[PDB]
């Protein structure tokens, strides 16, 4: 298939809400071009494909995890074991989806990146999928995933700060997810808040230099920073 075509089928599939197929097409795009870089359009498409495929399983896993422990509290052993094998099956899928994109990041996407925006986008993306592993892993697979997440987010942060404006949506999205990582995985509400509020304040101090469309782009991710901050900080 042509690469206008694989993008095309990726778009087709996004509209059919057939997200694994969207991943497949976009994948063939990501591999086809070498250390020549996806465009913005395609790089967003890929992210969205995988975000929707992982997202469904993350939702399933939370529901099933929440049922698991509640049934543990009641002592329904027969149920719990059923539930566990079922969770296992979901976690097998999570691992496969994460491995998929993590392998593609390490081999193609991250080392192909020449520009700051791309380097930050894909290192953040690498942080994301390690973070998703850490959500459901345990013990020492979990602390291994949390380490990989730290290292990727950090390098992303270092590069964003050197090169990207504090109002840049990619820099803002990086700050957003790094904070969530502190909150949900590391259980550090203060660090989470501090990191989000820093990013939010740096952007605020430039928001009014922006043209209109750029302002609207930034404000989208600033709203998310703001709402999290309001939530973590609420009575």
């Amino acid at each position: 298939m042509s690469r206008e075509e694989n993008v095309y089928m990726a778009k087709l599939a996004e509209q059919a809400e057939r997200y694994e197929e969207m991943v497949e097409y976009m994948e063939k795009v990501a591999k086809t071009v070498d250390v020549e870089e996806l465009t913005v359009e395609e790089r967003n498409l890929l992210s969205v494909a995988y975000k929707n495929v992982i997202g469904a399983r993350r939702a399933s896993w939370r529901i099933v995890s929440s049922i698991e422990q509640k049934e543990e509290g009641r002592g329904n052993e027969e149920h719990v074991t059923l539930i566990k094998e079922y969770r296992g099956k979901i976690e097998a899928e999570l691992s496969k989806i994460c491995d998929g994109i993590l392998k593609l990041l390490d081999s193609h996407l991250v080392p192909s990146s020449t520009a700051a925006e791309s380097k930050v986008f894909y290192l953040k993306m690498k942080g994301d999928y390690h973070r998703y592993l850490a959500e459901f892993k345990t013990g020492a697979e979990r602390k291994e995933a949390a380490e990989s997440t730290m290292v990727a987010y950090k390098a992303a942060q270092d590069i964003a700060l050197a090169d990207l404006a504090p109002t840049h949506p990619i820099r803002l999205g990086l700050a957003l997810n790094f904070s969530v990582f502190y909150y949900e995985i590391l259980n550090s509400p203060d660090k989470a808040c501090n990191l989000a509020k820093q990013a939010f304040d740096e952007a605020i101090s430039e928001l009014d230099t922006l043209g209109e469309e750029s302002y609207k782009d930034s404000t989208l991710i600033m709203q998310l920073l703001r709402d999290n901050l309001t939530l973590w900080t609420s009575d």
Binding site: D128, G173, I221, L224, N228
Partner: peptide
């Protein structure tokens, strides 16, 4: 509704 980036 703890929330992440749309990308």
């Amino acid at each position: 509704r703890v929330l992440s980036a749309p990308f």
